[PDB]
């Protein structure tokens, strides 16, 4: 989140009226809470799961410009993380097939699974 | 004599109780003879390589794609094979069964399956297209996708990832 | 009895064929039948389900208890979808189409 | 099955390769005292896992009449092979004395084995 907000909300960026909504089931710790407070005017956080359609409806995923899925780069099994990310993509495309998705993939042989989704 | 009925409502069921005409050398079966039985065979006889499975022609069969590890809970696949090996089916009507999955888990569960006539093993991965093409997945009568890794996960909704990925891979 | 034998031996034990076991072999099995080319093909072209049930029960002692029907069978336009859904115990006046499957309990014959 | 055991002792052990040692010498030494004649000694058959008995065999290999059945106390075939209906005593021991979330569930194997033998 620190790196993505550092690049995305850079001062030299041209004036863009875009708000960032972080949807995550795990509640933030103190440092994450402080980081969100430093950008309270442009960044909002909500507790929930992508796999639950109600939580997708809460964050207005049907009107969002794009969905960005970040990967856990430090995990015991990269294949499990890749499968979880692919299933999140499947859920998001099931809710709204016309949304634009940018995802992070750990292993190269797993991204072929993304070709199996019709949407 | 008790009888079992399928009905929309229980009120019409009572009409069946108040109805009167006036108003209106070799062992081929088990000891009980209810299932097909064969002599026990070692697991080495049923394991097929990819090329060997390619040579044999399988059509109208059953493909069981198993997600299992050497340290996972046992599904108990005998309960899946016993209904398919009952004696009310003739021998020629029996459907060949091919278990595609890890060889360690199938070694663990083979000691309850080695008495059934037509069972074969493909030691591969259900997520690999080469194994599914070797077993002629386009000619099978049914593909059963099972996940032995029923262990608890922090998110329960993520327990079905392997099955959904395999289903989409087979459909695509 | 099979439950007790399996509990005792933790395995399935074979045995030689006897007339009692061969008599025990006779049961009924679950099957699906197609009306395209069977003896019920003429009745499957717009006929009623009750006539099919009565004929199957009287002739072959076959118990029909459900229809398995293509999803786009009711649509006028042709479709390439081969998915089918389940109709459990249709009434007597339920109509039939040639592209249907019938759930049935079929007897054993040698 | 070929050998005939009558008036013997059957020790049904619930043990694993990584479980605490019971110390079965303390069970065999009283039964092998010199105040008993050789013909009055009761044959001892340890029915259980072979790994645990391999671990504890190095303190038992000096006693005259001891035999091993590498099976399971919960299997009726093993109990019928050892002639459980003719034994003088059946001793059911659970080496798996590890801590459990509920202590009352630490006796499940022994109770199940006892009911299985009685039935």
Sign (positive/negative) of CA torsion C48, C49, C54, C60?
positive
Residues 6+ apart with CB under 8 A from B13: B5, B7
Resolution for the entry shown, Å: 2.8
Please name the helix (run of DSSP H) or strand (run of DSSP E) that holds residue B29, with its range, or none. Answer: strand B29-30
- Nearest chain C Cα distance for residue D76, angstroms: 6
Find residue B64's DSSP bridge partners. B99, B144
Tokens standing for B85?
A: 């090996």
Tokens standing for D21?
A: 């040692």
Q: What is the C-alpha to C-alpha distance for residues B121 and B43, in angstroms, rounded to an integer? A: 9
Q: How far is CA A18 from CA A21, A44, C41, C53, in A?
A: 10, 12, 64, 65
Cβ atoms D44, D7 nearer than 8 A = no
Residues 6+ apart with CB under 8 A from B79: none
Q: How far is CA B102 from CA A28, B159, C9, in A?
A: 39, 19, 28
Q: Give the Cβ contact number of residue A35 at 10 Å.
A: 16
Cβ atoms B99, B66 nearer than 8 A = yes
Q: How far is CA C100 from CA B30, B128, C50, D46, D71, in A?
A: 37, 34, 15, 64, 55
Using a CB-CB cut-off of 8 Å, the residues of chain C touching B91 are none
Task: Give D102: exposed, middle or buried? Use CB within 10 Å, 0-12, 13-18, 19+.
Answer: exposed
Backbone angles phi, psi at B63, to 5 degrees: -115, 120
Query: Across the interface, do B168 and A113 touch by the CB < 8 Å criterion?
Result: yes
Backbone angles phi, psi at B34, to 5 degrees: -110, 0
Residue with tokens 């079905």: B160
How do beta strands B29-30 and A100-103 pair? unpaired
Q: What is the C-alpha to C-alpha distance for residues B81 and C9, in angstroms, rounded to an integer? A: 19
DSSP state at residue B141: S
Find residue C48's DSSP bridge partners. C95
Note whether A touches B: 3 CB pairs or more under 8 A: yes
* Cα of A119 vs its chain's centroid, Å: 18
* Cα of C28 vs its chain's centroid, Å: 10
Q: Is A19 annotated as a binding residue?
A: yes
Query: Across the interface, do C8 and D75 touch by the CB < 8 Å criterion?
Result: no
Query: Across the interface, do C15 and B31 touch by the CB < 8 Å criterion?
Result: yes
The residues in B 151-170 lying below 8 A from C, measured between CB atoms, are: none
DSSP state at residue A93: H
Q: CA triplet C28, C31, C35: central angle to 5 degrees? A: 130
The residues in A 23-52 lying below 8 A from B, measured between CB atoms, are: 25, 49, 51-52
Query: Across the interface, do A51 and B172 touch by the CB < 8 Å criterion?
Result: no
Listing DSSP states for A14-70 in one string gives ------EEEE-SSPP-HHHHHHHHHTTTTEEEE---TTSHHHHHHTTTTS-SEEEE-
Query: Experimental method used, please?
Result: cryo-EM
**Cα distance from N-terminal residue to C-terminal residue, chain B:** 52
Query: Across the interface, do B29 and C21 touch by the CB < 8 Å criterion?
Result: yes
Residues making up chain B, counted from first to last: 172
Query: Please, how many CA atoms are within 13 Å of residue A43, restricted to the half-sphere of its CB?
Result: 18
Q: Is A42 annotated as a binding residue?
A: yes
Q: Does B83 touch chain C (CB under 8 A)?
A: no
> For chain B, how big is the Rg over CA atoms in Å?
21
Count contacts between C and D (CB, < 8 Å).
6
**Cα distance from N-terminal residue to C-terminal residue, chain D:** 21
Using a CB-CB cut-off of 8 Å, the residues of chain B touching A116 are 165, 168-169, 171-172
Query: Across the interface, do B6 and C22 touch by the CB < 8 Å criterion?
Result: no
Q: What is the C-alpha to C-alpha distance for residues A70 and B58, in angstroms, rounded to an integer? A: 43
Residues 6+ apart with CB under 8 A from A86: A110, A113, A114, B161, B165
Cβ atoms A69, A78 nearer than 8 A = no
């Amino acid at each position: 989140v620190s790196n993505f907000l550092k690049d995305f909300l850079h001062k030299d960026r041209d004036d863009v009226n875009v708000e960032i909504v972080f949807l995550h089931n795990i509640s933030p710790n103190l440092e994450l809470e402080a980081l969100f407070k430093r950008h309270f005017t442009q960044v909002e956080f909500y507790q929930g799961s992508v796999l639950n359609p109600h939580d997708l409806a809460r964050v207005k995923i049907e009107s969002a410009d794009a969905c960005l899925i970040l990967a856990n780069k430090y995990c015991a099994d990269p294949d499990a993380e890749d499968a979880s990310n692919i299933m999140r993509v499947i859920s998001i495309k099931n809710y709204h097939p016309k949304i634009r998705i940018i995802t992070q993939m750990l292993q190269y042989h797993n991204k072929a699974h993304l070709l199996n989704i019709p949407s | 004599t008790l009888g079992f009925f399928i009905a929309s409502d229980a009120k019409e069921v009572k009409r069946a109780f108040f109805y009167c005409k006036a108003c209106h050398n070799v062992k081929k079966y088990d000891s009980t003879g209810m299932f097909h039985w064969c002599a026990p065979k070692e697991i080495e006889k049923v394991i097929l390589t990819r090329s060997e499975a390619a040579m044999t022609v399988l059509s109208g069969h059953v493909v069981v794609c198993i997600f299992g590890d050497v340290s996972s809970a046992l599904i108990g696949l005998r309960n899946l094979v016993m209904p398919l090996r009952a004696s009310n089916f003739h021998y020629h009507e029996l459907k060949h069964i091919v278990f595609v999955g890890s060889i360690e888990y199938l070694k663990r569960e083979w000691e309850t399956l080695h008495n059934f006539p037509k069972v074969s093993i493909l030691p591969g991965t259900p997520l690999s297209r080469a194994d599914l093409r070797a077993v002629n997945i386009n000619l099978c009568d049914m593909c059963v996708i099972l996940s032995a890794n029923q262990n608890n996960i922090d998110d329960t909704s993520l327990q079905d990832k392997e099955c959904i990925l395999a289903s989409l891979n087979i459909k695509s | 009895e099979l439950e007790a034998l399996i509990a005792e031996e933790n395995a399935l034990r074979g045995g030689y064929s006897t007339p009692q076991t061969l008599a025990n072999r006779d049961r009924c099995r679950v099957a699906q039948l197609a009306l395209l080319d069977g003896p019920f093909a003429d009745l499957g072209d717009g006929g009623c389900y009750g006539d099919l049930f009565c004929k199957a029960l009287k002739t072959y002692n076959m118990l029909c208890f459900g229809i398995y029907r293509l999803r786009d069978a009711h649509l006028s336009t042709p479709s390439q979808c081969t998915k089918r859904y389940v109709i459990t115990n249709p009434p007597y006046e339920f109509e039939l189409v040639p592209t249907d499957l019938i759930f049935c309990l079929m007897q054993f014959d040698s």
